[PDB]
């Protein structure tokens, strides 16, 4: 009977580096460790590591090495979050034409409007969301929309390249040379924090989808919601679900708690990211002399939000205090 490699599921040679692995995964690990390798994933940090596809993702193979513990049908809630995850939209940008600061921001505002029309559909598909009161459903989307869109932008930018670039859409990516000109240096620094943190943390697709759901449940009204008790239960369901994603990712790493600390610390830092992004957004919206265009969808949210952040009618929910 054939003993299998706990990394690629190929006939194992022995107990290499604590884990029962095959000769090839054993040498791959030793090479990747002492070669101090920086492996970037072409997928979403969860590629299948099997005998044929072990050559494919070395970033994932080195993760399945560490989740095994190397050293020197029934649909789950997250499987649903994957299925309801929106398709990536195009800015419809005429890239073969001269660029402008106004043109890029207007295009991006219009794209963000289409994204909101998609994020509302995505929101309704989250088990439990349609179960809250309508004034709560609207408030959750009104509070956490920039949080949603910037977190998703970070994932799209993380996936698109190891270089610092904001992948807003496949046809509207702003390279480091362009994001550092004075017209947009500071705004891009906040949007780039998300992709660099997801990068640093090697956030898997499962952990990402759960954190994105938790971003929708990250802000509540100062005097609470109408269906607050249900909201707390739903919020806590997805925190239990993010922990399940961390158990799947780390496997036998022992750092499940440490992983959760970092991801929840990031979920908290999203308030600061959004607060910065919102300040540019509102400032621009109200500045008549700029004359940048905003979609009817977003302009209704922004106008019905500006006198709420200033009036402290928001209770930012934090894991860390």
């Amino acid at each position: 009977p054939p003993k299998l490699c706990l990394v690629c599921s190929d006939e194992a040679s022995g107990c290499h580096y604590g884990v029962l692995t095959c000769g090839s995964c054993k040498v791959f690990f030793k090479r990747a460790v002492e070669g101090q390798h920086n492996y970037l994933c072409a997928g979403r940090n969860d590629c299948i590591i099997d005998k044929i596809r072990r050559k494919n993702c070395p970033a994932c193979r080195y993760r399945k090495c560490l989740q095994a513990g190397m050293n020197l049908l029934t649909p789950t809630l997250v499987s649903l979050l994957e299925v309801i995850e929106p398709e990536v939209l195009y800015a419809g940008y005429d890239s073969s034409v001269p660029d402008s600061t106004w043109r890029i921001m207007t295009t991006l505002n219009m794209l963000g409007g289409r994204q909101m029309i998609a994020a509302v559909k995505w929101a309704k598909a989250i088990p439990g969301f349609r179960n809250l009161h309508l004034d709560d459903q609207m408030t959750l989307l009104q509070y956490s929309w920039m949080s949603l869109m910037a977190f998703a932008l970070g994932w799209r930018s993380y996936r698109q390249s190891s270089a610092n670039l904001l992948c807003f859409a496949p046809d509207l990516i702003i390279n480091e040379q362009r994001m550092t000109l004075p017209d947009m240096y500071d705004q891009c620094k906040h949007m780039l924090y998300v992709s660099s943190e997801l990068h640093r943390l090697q956030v898997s697709y499962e952990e990402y989808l759960c954190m994105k759901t938790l971003l929708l449940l990250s802000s509540v009204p100062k005097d609470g919601l109408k269906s607050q008790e249900l909201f707390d239960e739903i919020r806590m369901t997805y925190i239990k679900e993010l922990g399940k994603a961390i158990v799947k990712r780390e496997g036998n790493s022992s750092q499940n708690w440490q992983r959760f600390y970092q991801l929840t610390k990031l979920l908290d830092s999203m308030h600061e990211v959004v607060e910065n992004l919102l300040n540019y957004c509102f400032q621009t919206f109200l500045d008549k002399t700029m004359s940048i265009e905003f979609p009817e969808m977003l302009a209704e949210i922004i106008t019905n939000q500006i006198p709420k952040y200033s009036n402290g009618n928001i209770k930012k929910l934090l894991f860390h205090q």
Binding site: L134, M138, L141, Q142, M297, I301
Partner: peptide
């Protein structure tokens, strides 16, 4: 009235 968000929310 109402907002496009409210209109889009209850639209099954």
């Amino acid at each position: 009235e109402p907002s496009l968000l409210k209109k889009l929310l209850l639209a099954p």
